[PDB]
Every structure is written in structure tokens, then in C-alpha cells.
Amino acid sequence: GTTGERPFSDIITSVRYWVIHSITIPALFIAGWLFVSTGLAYDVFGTPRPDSYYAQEQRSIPLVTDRFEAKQQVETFLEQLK
Amino acid sequence: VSYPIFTVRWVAVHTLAVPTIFFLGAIAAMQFIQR
Amino acid sequence: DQESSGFAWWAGNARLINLSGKLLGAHVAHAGLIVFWAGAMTLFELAHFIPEKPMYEQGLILIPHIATLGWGVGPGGEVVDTFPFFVVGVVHLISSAVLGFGGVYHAIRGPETLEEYSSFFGYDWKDKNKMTTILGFHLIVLGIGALLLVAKAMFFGGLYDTWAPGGGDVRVITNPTLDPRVIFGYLLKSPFGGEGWIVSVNNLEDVVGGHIWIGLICIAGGIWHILTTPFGWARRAFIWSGEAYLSYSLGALSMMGFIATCFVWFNNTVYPSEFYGPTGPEASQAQAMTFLIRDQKLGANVGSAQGPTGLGKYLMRSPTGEIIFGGETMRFWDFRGPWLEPLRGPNGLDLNKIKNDIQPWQERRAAEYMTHAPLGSLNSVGGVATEINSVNFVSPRSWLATSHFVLAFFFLVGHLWHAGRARAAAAGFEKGIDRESEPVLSMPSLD
Amino acid sequence: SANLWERFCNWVTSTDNRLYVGWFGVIMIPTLLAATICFVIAFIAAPPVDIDGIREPVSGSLLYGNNIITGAVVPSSNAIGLHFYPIWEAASLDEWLYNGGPYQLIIFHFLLGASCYMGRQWELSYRLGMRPWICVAYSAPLASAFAVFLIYPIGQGSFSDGMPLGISGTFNFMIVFQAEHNILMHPFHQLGVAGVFGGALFCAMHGSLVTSSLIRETTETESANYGYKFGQEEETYNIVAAHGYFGRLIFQYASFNNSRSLHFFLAAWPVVGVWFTALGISTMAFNLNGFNFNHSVIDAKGNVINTWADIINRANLGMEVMHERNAHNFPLDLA
Amino acid sequence: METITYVFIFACIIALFFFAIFFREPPRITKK
Amino acid sequence: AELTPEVLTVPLNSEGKTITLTEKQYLEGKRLFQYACASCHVGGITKTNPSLDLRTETLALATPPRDNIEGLVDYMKNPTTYDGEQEIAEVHPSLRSADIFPKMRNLTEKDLVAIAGHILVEPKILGDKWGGGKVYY
Amino acid sequence: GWFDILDDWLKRDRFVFVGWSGILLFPCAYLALGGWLTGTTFVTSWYTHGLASSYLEGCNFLTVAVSTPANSMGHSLLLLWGPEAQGDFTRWCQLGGLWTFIALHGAFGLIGFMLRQFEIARLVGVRPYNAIAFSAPIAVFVSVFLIYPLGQSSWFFAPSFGVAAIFRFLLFFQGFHNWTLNPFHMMGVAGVLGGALLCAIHGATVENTLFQDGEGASTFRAFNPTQAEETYSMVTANRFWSQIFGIAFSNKRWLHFFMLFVPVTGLWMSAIGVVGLALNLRSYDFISQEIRAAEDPEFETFYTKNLLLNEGIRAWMAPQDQPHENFVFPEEVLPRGNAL
């Protein structure tokens, strides 16, 4: 009924844990928040910002139409201020 | 007993715990984006 | 006092089956939550309520209940004074504290049992007399209540009658149908299409009238039980225990829950389309009305118009010969309503009235109700599942009807569950088959 | 004679009957025999039914050009709506078969009997000294038949809108439903498939775990099943070896060791899940449909940016726009 | 021809049903 | 890809003169359009008479012209048929009939201008979608 | 020897058993789950399906998804460092590289997991019927997320990882393959539906046929974790069903094997059906029906009705569901009933 690991119950209760995690947990949180709020995430994943789906006039979709020259084709889609 | 700290369980627990919160923080921020 | 050596934690409230005192705290604390809600919700509704806008378009379900009783409204369901709403809301909210007090008290301070701290209030589940008597008390309290309505309608103001001669308005009922042949007639009515049983009540006289009968009949039975004990069969038929009694009341609520679902969905009278939304059939009828009205203005002869199937674009016949609206709307030819009745003749929709007696207030009524059918999504997007976002709306009739079917259902399960346990509890095996004396093992093999 | 009726009641209730005809049985057995006999005759020889009340008969019987997969018993006419249509309400049988009379005779008798079947599933449990609640598990599949055969029609205003009695006829009920209610996007349905998927999953879970941890008592060339005798005292499998394996598959505390807690879960999961699915059809019977995220995410200018939710809407429109070809005369489908 | 085939199999399943319920192998206890 | 003031420039009157709405008026219009129109005019169509939509072109060939702020505003006060040879304020929401259509009571000249502006700006953004029905959803 | 020491360490009984299998399982399984959770919130499907598919864009738990790659990609494995993405990460994301990532990784993760079962079983010394059973879910994943699109034009027609993105996969199969009319799919449901019955029925049968081994009502505590007597009356259960249903078990060993068979056989059948749908070898129509429907305009079955529903699904969905085809269907060509 047991193995080496220190019974979670004890840890989730140890004042030491919280003294550690009261810092660690919110840290990660504020980090991820900034990841989004600084617009970094948008560039890490090429995800369009609310004003970057179409060009002002165009109403067509930037559909990638060929595998090998896709990356090149994608780059050109960003060109038309999309 | 004299339990250790850094264990395999610990590793596992964190591979899921750490990213999660990082995401929950990210998502929570998204709730304010607009147009 | 009570812990795991009673019942399991998740079955905690069953540890109170034999602690009259504390089991009273529960019921008094609980009854507070209901009053609390009713009150706190009314104020929430009013806080958002916009006078110059339909109630059904604001997610209200309590303010329209008050409106029906003739309070804060006038001609055509026009909201006059929002004070009665505020009052009913605050009053309840207060009484919730009073009850809540008693609840908390009886469950953590006062006697844990009653039998000794007063033999009048203390009780024994198997005490067929105490039971029939307490039941008798409540049968009276409910009976007075039924009359509390009859009073408001006949003396203190009236109720909202949508069928009002001059058009929907608060009217004082001073002629309750008391004729038993009529009153109890409803109970002998079919529950299918047309003859609709109880939900077919279509005028306040019967409503008020019927309530007079119930009020009396109820208190009558309230006294009878005070002054009696269950007979012979009554005893050799039922199971007498704390659970068994619960169960009986569970199936009872269940049944009333289903009846309520159909009332708010079908009934026009006690649930005014002016405060709630238009009924399901009423809206589909309204579409036929609207377009029969439109195209007729474009020069079309509604009477002889032939639709794709050769059935009658605008007007057709029901299975029994009556002239009704055409289209898929042929299924709702049992719909009756203030706005539509003046067009009906002795044979159903009259081609002459339809041809030149349609009034403007009806055209826009039909338009209104057509564009407010009880169709919507969970996230509150009015229309068909394929509609676009814009009109945030879901008919109160839809909310009520669904919520109450779920509740009604689970209660029927609750019934089964508590009834099945009571029968096993009584006879005594609700905890397992006796390893030693295993009943099945004493029965011949059918093989 | 100890008293005829006294005896009668002793026979009916007798637990020595091959099949326990109970008190509920006295209503069940006749109602179920009417339903089945009428069904079988209908499905084989019944003539075309004007389901949509628009004089456009749909033949769903074998002898009239159907096979098992397509054939069905067609719902009563829409002209009839929710009206009661017993044989004695028709000028003739010819009229009764044309307006889908058999359907009502079937659904009503079945639902009736299938309810008593539950009532019986209690009675015998009582007469045998075993705990009740088995019938409460059967309350879920029943509550569905009810939802699909009665609640939805009451709600929609006609029995012609109830699920047909046939394979393909059922697929029709689904495809159309989805179009008008977008059920896949409704919480109750999702919980339903969770219960059903889960059920099958757990059914496989238990099934395997147990059969795999059986105590050896059989030869190498002898059916491992024989290692069990009907009416055993001790268990036939090592529930401690079972838990030992499964506990290592995931992790100890995420594994059952209490057969009673295991079997409760085993029953609780599907029944609860199906209960919600039944409440889904019964709720969407009053037009409280699934989530409508059509044109939700829109860009900075106002353009509509589609999601998979929109692609679903197109598929739905196709069904909407094509179902019941000649039955609609007006813009909005409010029935 | 097809109708006959469908009804036959059906009639065969019902026949099975009967035999399965009323002509099973009696379920014997302990000494089996 | 944004709602530039270039897009919020819609014809004010019949004589070519234009007006430029602001992101505040637009949203406000859009909100008001939902409050008193969506009910029957969701997505530029007309549920209780599908033959007449809010397409700018449709409003252009109307009589009088209703394809400008001035036009639509007048309409919201005294509505007429497509040929204008008949007033329909009795079965259509309007200012001169707010007693009959309460939703129109609050509505002030400020509100009317926004709603009107919304009707002319939507097709500019959505295009074909605005006019057509389920076909374009 | 180091090997036996490497072994020793791995097969050590921890909280979360690692094992040899783990060297394959955990890396993949985590990457699969991770990639989804990543895409679900950050990556878009604009350049791939002209669709917003992540929280970052406004999608909710239902509308979010990791959409398939373009149809242009074909059956390309789409490696981060392959001819398409060219080592670039952002591009990879925009070309739906995360799909083949999740797919292929998760695929191996299911191999590892079954291996685990096999490995852990051996150690604990129990029979591997937990492994046999798990073959069913593999077959499904393999046939649907791999074999199927491998028969079509590209990965684009494989089910996209997401809630809503799966509902269209369902609707598609109806509209295009008339999948519900397929004998194998039916067997499929018969197994899952019938399997979810055995689950429920057996559970309830046990809880309500229990012996009394305690004095409490909550009979849960009353259980002997250390075998001995049967905790429920198998003899009573038999008689119960034998009188209410007419048929009843009477060999727990068989009753339990049956519970493995039913849902596992079901899923296997449903797989074969799809393996045929890959080549489009569907069970779309009944020829005898169509021929009579052609010559005779008054013949109507619930089958004919359905096919019309399919026609509508195909015509109204195809445009925005298959962008690479640049479909343009004039309003007048769009099939529609009356009024609607």
C-alpha cells in the first residue's frame, strides 16, 4: 500500500510547500498572461491578430495551394498586409 | 519515515502541473482581447 | 450524536429519519431557501426589468406570475406600477430570515428530538393517527391558501384576463363556476389533442370557481383526517415508515411536475402570452395568419389558393371538417386565442371575416408572436438552430417547461428509489440477502 | 378451494412460475402482446402512410417494396397531430391504415407495457428478498423510449414527429433532429455519448480485468470456463491480483479494490449518462436546443471568421432545407 | 421472394427464442 | 483589416452629401438595431415579408429613396410601402406609433441616426451576407 | 551487466510505474496531449481551413481544434524539418504540422500503452486480456485517423482533433458516405450500445443481489477486500433474470468474458466499415430501390427520404468544407424544398 514517495497529503499541508508555491504558482500564471498580453504568442504561432485575417478590401482566404512552395506562398500572404 | 523530495513522481506531476498553470494564465489574459 | 455509525456521509440526511426535532430544523431552514429565492429573484428581475418592453424578452418568470394575479399591470398587459413587484420581492426576502432563523435553531440548539420536549409536536412515523392528523393540519393550510386566491380575484382586485371583452385587462371575477358537473368535468376530459384535460381551462370563472371547490374539499379532508385513523384496507395496503411516506409524496410532486410542464406550454389563460411568450401552437398559427394577411393584400384569394401538395396554401380542412390554417400548421388547429378568435365562425375560420374584418392590432399581434416563437438555444440565441447571433432570446415558456420536466422526471426516479427501499426496509432485507436463510434457496427449481 | 380469488392472487404472485407474471405483469403481458402482434403484421403487410398529412403516402412495409433496413412502421398523420386515433375512430380500417393508425396502437401499448416491465423488475426482486433498484437502472432506457416516442411528440405538437419504428426511419429521426435542434452541440447529448462510450469502455475494462485474473482450475486443453460451478461459495477470480495489475497500469489510488464500489460505478455511469441523454430529447422537445455559436468569432472590421461550429451549420441547413420537401408553405419552420 | 426470406429468418429467431427459454440446460447448483 | 472611418462614411442625403459615423455611434446603432429590429430584421432580411430586405440597392430603388441617413430616419418616424403610396405606421414600429410599439418610445433622434447608419454600414462590411438569407450564413 | 541494472531500475515499483514500455509511452503520450493543448489555445487554422481554431482567436472548448493540414500537403508526414516547413516552427504551425505531430505521436503512444499493459501483466503474473481488449481502440484510431485519410486525397479529410471538428466528421460521413446505412457501422453501435447495457445491467444486478455482511445501510464498507465468499448471490441473480427476461447467466467466467467480447467485437466491425470508406467503397444505396424510384414517382420509403437529406448536406456544406475546390454554387443550383 506504499512506495518511497512522500504522501501528497503531507506535502499539500506542509507550510514549507506553500511558502514555496505561493511564489511559484502565481509566477507561472503571470508569465503565461504576459505571453498573451505582450502579443508574443501571436508571433510564436503565426496566429492572426483580430486585424490580420484579410487585407482591407480583399475578402478572399489565404489558402495554401501547394506543398513544397507553401512556406514561400504563406510569406506572400503576409505581404498584402494580411 | 525519511521521504525524499525530487522523485520520479515529482517530475511527472510537474510536466503537467507547470504547463497547465502557464496556460490557465495565458487563457485568462485572452478574456480581455477585443476589436 | 450521529456519525458514520448511522449512515454514510453522503447519506447524511437519512441519519435524521428519527430525530423529529432536528428533522424540523431542516424543513424550516429549507422552506427558508425557497422564500429566499422567490424574494431575492423577484428583486433581481425588477432590478433588470424594463417597463416599455415585453416581459418574455427579459427572462422573467416571477414578475409575470404576479402580473397574472392583477398586480402592476393594466390594459393589454401594460405595466403600470412596479411597486407590487418590489413589495412581494422584499417581503419574501425578509420572511426568509425569520424562517432561516428557526431552521438553524431547531437543527443546532433546540431539542434534538421532540417527543419529550412536547408530546404534541413530537411524532412517531408508525403512529397512523399523528400522521393522518399532521397531514390533516397541512390539508387545511393548503385549503385556506386555495381560498386566498379566490379572495384576491373576487374581492381584492381580480386577475389578468387575456380574454377580456375589451381586450386583455385586469378583471374582477364575480361569478365563479360552482356547478360541479362543469368543474369536475375537466377531470373526465381526455388528455389528447382537442379535449385537453385540466390544461384546457380557458376562462377565469372556472379557475376561480374550481379553486373554491378545492379550497373547501381540501379543508374538509383536513378535518376528517384530524378526526380519524386510516381504515382497514388503507393499512393492509400501504407501508408505514418514514421513507415510505416520503416516496408517496415524491411520486406526487413528479406527477404535478409533468402537469405543470404541459400547462405552461399549452395553456393561454392562467399563463398569459402577454407576460410569458406566445404558446408553441400560437406562434405557428401566427405565421399562417401573417402570410395569409400579407398575400391577401397583394390580391390573392386565400379561399381557393392551392399549395404544392394540392391541399390549400392558406386554408384547409381539419379531419372533422372545420376550416383551419394550412401548411404544417394543420397540427395546431386546436389553438384558441384572443387575437385569433374574432375570425373564427361556427365552422372555423370564416372566409368573409378573414376577407375584410382583419384588424391592424391583429396583424401586428400575429407579426409579434410569429417573430417570438419559443425556439432558442442553451446560450440564449432565439430562432432555429441554423439562425445567426443577434436576437438574444428564449421564451419563458421554453425555460419553465424544460426545467420542470427534468425535475418532474428525476422525482419519478426518486419515487421509485425511495419506494423500492421502503418495501425492502419494511420486510427487512434492504441491506443484503441473509447469507444463512437465502429465500431463493428454499424455492423449487423451475429450470 | 381456499378461496378462488385468494388462490388466483397466490398464483399470479407465485415465485414458482417459469416466467414471473406479476401484478404489473397482468397489465404488461396483454399490452406487450398487442404491440408485438400489431407491429409484426404492420411491418410486413401494412400499406402506405400519409405521415406528413399532405397526402403523400410513405410505404414502409416489406410487401410494399421495403427490406429490413429500409422498412418501418410509419408514424400517424400530421393531420391527426396529438389527437387520439383508436381503430373505432375510423370509418374503416382502410382509413385507419392510411392515417398511420397502427403506430399509435403500438407506441401506446409498448410504452405502457415497458413501464409495467419496470414495475415487475421491482416486484420479483421483492418476492425474492433481494434489494430493489435494478428497475431504476432500467428506468434510463425506458425514459428514452418515452422521450423519443411520447415526450418529443407532445412537445412538437404531433405524433407524426415521433421516431418511426424502423432502421432507416430512425436515421431520419436523427438527421432531421440535428438540423432543427443541433443536438451534437448540446450538453445532455454529450453526456449521453459519454455514458455510452464509457459504458462500453468500462464494460470492456471490468470484463477483461476479471476474466484475466481467474484462478486456475482448468486443463491446458479444457475450456477455462468449466473452472466455475453454478452455486459456488468462494470467488472465481483474484480481485486482489486484478487490482494489483490495474493499480500499476495507471496508479494505485486510481484503481478499485472494493468489488461493491466497482459495481456501483459500473452501473451508475451509463444509467446516469443515459438519463441525461433522455432529458436532452425531452428538453429539446420544447425547443431549448444546443449551443448556437454561429458567427461568434468576428475580426477587427466585422468580417465573420468561421469556426468548425459554422461548418456544422452548413451541414445542418442542407438537412433543414431538404427535409419534408412539400410540407412547408411559409418562411419559418415552427413545427 | 425477398419478403419470404426476411420473414423466415425472423420466424427462425423467434423459434430459437422459445427453445432457448423453455429448453435450456437446467442450471444445476454446487454438484455440477 | 479594420473598421476604418473610411468604412464609416455613408451617404447623408439624396444630394450626394455624406456623413462619417464614429465607432461609438456604430456599436450603439448595432445595439439599438438588436433592441428594436433584429426581432424581424436579423441579418438584413425581413421575416414577416421576405420580399423586402435592407440591402442598400433595395433601399435605393425604394420610394422615396431610403438609402441614406435622411431616408431611413424619416422611415423610422413615418413608414411607407415600397412605392410610398401608403403609410404603414400602424403595423410597423415608428415614432408616430410608439404607443403601439413601446420599444420605439425611448428612441430619440440620436438613436434613430445610429440605427440608420448601422443599416448602411453593415453591407459595407458583410457584403452579400447582409442582404441574402440562410444561403449566405 | 548494465542492462539488468537498467532493467532493475525501470521495473521498480514506483507510484507511476515506468517500465521498458515507458521509454516509448511517456515521451509520445505527453507530446500528443501537449501538442493538442498547445494548438487548442495558440495555433490557428486560417491558412489551412480558413477557420479560427484556438482560444487566442476566440474559440471556446467546443469550437476549438487542431485542424488537419491543407489538401495541398497531400499525405505528407509534415516534419518540422521537412520540405514544407523547412525547419521553421511558426510556418510548421500554420501548415498544420501540429496535426501529423499529434497523430503520429499519439499513434506510438497507443502502441507503448498496450505494450505497457503487456509488460505490467507479465510482471504481476496475470493474463493479458486487458491487452487483447485494447486492440479495439487501436483499430479505431488506426483506421479512422490514418487508414481512412490515406485512402482519400490527403490528411485534410481526416478527422480534425477537436470537439466540434469531430461533429462535422460525423455529419460528413452521413452526407457523403451514408455511413449510418452501413452494416459494419450498425454492428459497431450494436456493440457499444449493447456494451453500455451489459455494464449497467451487471452493475445493478450485483448491487441489488448482495448478501448482508454488515449492520449498516451503506453496504460499501461491508466488503471483504481479501476474497473468500462471493459478495453477491450469483444463485439469486440467475433466478431473477430467468423469470423476468427468460434468459440468465450462470457462469461468472462466461458472463465476464462476454463483457469483453461484445464492445471489442463491435469496435472492430465499425473499423472495417471505415477501412472500406477509405476507398469510398461505401454502403450508400440499394439498387433495387433506386430503379423503382426512377420509373415510379409515387414510391417513397424512409430510405429515399434520407438520400435527399444527404444531397442537401453535400450541396450546402461542400463550399466552405472543401476550400481547395473553389466551389461556387449559384443560388439557383442549390437543391431546396418548398418555402424553406
Ligand code: CLA
Ligand atoms: C414548521 C413550523 C414550526 C414548528 C412546527 C415548530 C414547532 C415547535 N417550535 Mg418552533 N419555530 C419555528 C417554526 C416552527 N416551530 C420558526 C420559523 C421559528 C423562528 C421564529 C421557531 C422558533 C422557535 C423557538 C425559539 C422555540 C421553538 C419551539 C418549538 C417547539 C415548542 C412549541 C412552541 O414553540 O409553541 C409556541 C406556541 C404556539 C402554539 C403559538 C404559535 C402561534 C403563532 C403566534 C401564530 C403562527 C401563525 C401561522 C404562521 C399561521 C397559521 C394560521 C393558519 C392555520 C390560519 C415546537 C416543537 C421551542 C422549543 O424549542 O421548545 C422545545 C422554542 O423555544 N420554535
Ligand code: CLA
Ligand atoms: C422530497 C425530496 C427528497 C428528499 C427529502 C430526499 C431525501 C433523502 N434522500 Mg433522496 N432523492 C430525491 C429526492 C429526495 N430525497 C430524488 C428526486 C432522487 C433522484 C435523483 C433521490 C435520490 C436519492 C438517492 C440515490 C439517495 C437518496 C437518499 C436520501 C436520504 C439521505 C439524504 C442524503 O443522501 O443526502 C446527501 C446529499 C448529497 C450527497 C447531495 C447530492 C448532490 C446532487 C446529486 C447534485 C445536484 C445538482 C445541483 C443542482 C447542481 C448545483 C451546481 C453545483 C456546482 C453547486 C434522504 C432521506 C440516500 C439514501 O441513503 O437512501 C435512503 C440515497 O442513497 N436520495
Ligand code: CLA
Ligand atoms: C437542505 C439543506 C440541508 C439541511 C437543512 C441540512 C440539515 C441538517 N443536516 Mg445535512 N446535509 C446536506 C444538506 C442539508 N442538511 C447535504 C447536501 C449533505 C451532504 C453533503 C448533508 C450531510 C449531512 C450529514 C453527513 C449530517 C447532516 C446533518 C444534519 C442535521 C444536523 C445539522 C448539523 O450537523 O449541524 C452542524 C453545525 C455546524 C457545523 C454549523 C453549520 C452552519 C449553519 C448550520 C448554517 C448557518 C446558516 C446561515 C449562514 C446563518 C443564518 C443566520 C440568520 C438567520 C440570523 C441538520 C438537520 C447531521 C445529522 O445527521 O444530524 C445529527 C449529519 O451527520 N447533514
Ligand code: CLA
Ligand atoms: C428551476 C427553475 C428556474 C428557471 C426556470 C429559471 C429560469 C431562468 N433563469 Mg434562473 N435561477 C434559478 C432557477 C430557475 N431559473 C435558481 C434556483 C437560481 C439561483 C441560483 C437562478 C438564478 C438565476 C440568475 C442569476 C439568472 C437567472 C436567469 C434566468 C433566465 C435565463 C435563463 C438562463 O440563461 O439559463 C442558462 C442556464 C443554464 C444553461 C445552466 C443549466 C444548469 C443545469 C440545470 C445543470 C444540470 C447539470 C446536472 C445537475 C449535473 C448533476 C449530475 C451529477 C450528479 C452526476 C431564465 C428565465 C437569468 C436572467 O434572469 O436573465 C435574463 C439570470 O441572470 N436565473
Ligand code: CLA
Ligand atoms: C393530498 C392530501 C391527502 C392525503 C395525503 C390523503 C391521504 C389519505 N386519505 Mg384522504 N382525503 C383528502 C386528502 C388527502 N388524503 C381530501 C381532500 C379528502 C376529501 C375529499 C379526503 C378524503 C378521504 C376519505 C373519505 C378517505 C381518505 C383516506 C385516506 C387514506 C387512504 C387513501 C388511499 O388508500 O388511497 C388509495 C385509493 C385507491 C385504492 C383508489 C385509486 C383510484 C384513484 C382514485 C383513481 C385513479 C387515480 C388517477 C391515476 C389520477 C387521474 C385523475 C382522475 C381524476 C382521472 C390516506 C392516508 C381513507 C381513509 O383511510 O380514511 C382515514 C378514506 O376513507 N381520504
Ligand code: CLA
Ligand atoms: C522516444 C520516443 C519518441 C518517438 C518514437 C518519436 C517519434 C517521432 N517523432 Mg518525436 N520527439 C520525442 C520523442 C519521440 N519521438 C521527444 C521527447 C521530443 C521532444 C524533444 C520529440 C520531438 C519531436 C518533434 C519536434 C518532431 C518529432 C517527430 C517525430 C516523428 C518523425 C521523426 C523522425 O523522422 O525520426 C527519425 C528517426 C531516427 C532519428 C531514429 C534513428 C535511430 C538510428 C538507430 C540511429 C542511427 C544514427 C546514425 C547517424 C545513422 C547512420 C546512417 C548513415 C548512412 C548516415 C516520429 C514519429 C516529427 C514529427 O512529428 O513530424 C510530423 C517532429 O517534427 N518529434
Ligand SMILES: CC1=C(/C=C/C(C)=C/C=C/C(C)=C/C=C/C=C(C)/C=C/C=C(C)/C=C/C2=C(C)CCCC2(C)C)C(C)(C)CCC1
Ligand atoms: C507542441 C510541441 C511541443 C510540446 C509542448 C508541450 C509538451 C506542451 C504542453 C502543454 C500542456 C501540458 C498544457 C496544459 C494545459 C491545460 C489546461 C489549459 C487545462 C485547463 C483545465 C481546465 C479549465 C479544467 C476544467 C475543469 C474540468 C475539465 C473538469 C470540471 C471542473 C473544471 C472546471 C476544473 C514541443 C515543444 C515538444 C515541440 C513542438 C511541438
Ligand SMILES: CC1=C(\C=C/C(C)=C/C=C/C(C)=C/C=C/C=C(C)/C=C/C=C(C)/C=C/C2=C(C)CCCC2(C)C)C(C)(C)CCC1
Ligand atoms: C441546517 C444546515 C444547513 C442549512 C442551513 C440553511 C438552509 C440555512 C438557511 C438560511 C436562510 C434562509 C437565511 C436567510 C437569510 C435572509 C436574510 C439575512 C435577509 C436579508 C434581508 C434584507 C437585508 C432585506 C432587504 C433589502 C431590501 C428591502 C432592498 C434593498 C436590499 C436589501 C437586501 C437590504 C447546512 C446545509 C448549511 C449545513 C447542515 C446544517
Ligand SMILES: [Cl-]
Ligand atoms: Cl424527410
Ligand SMILES: [Fe+2]
Ligand atoms: Fe462483475
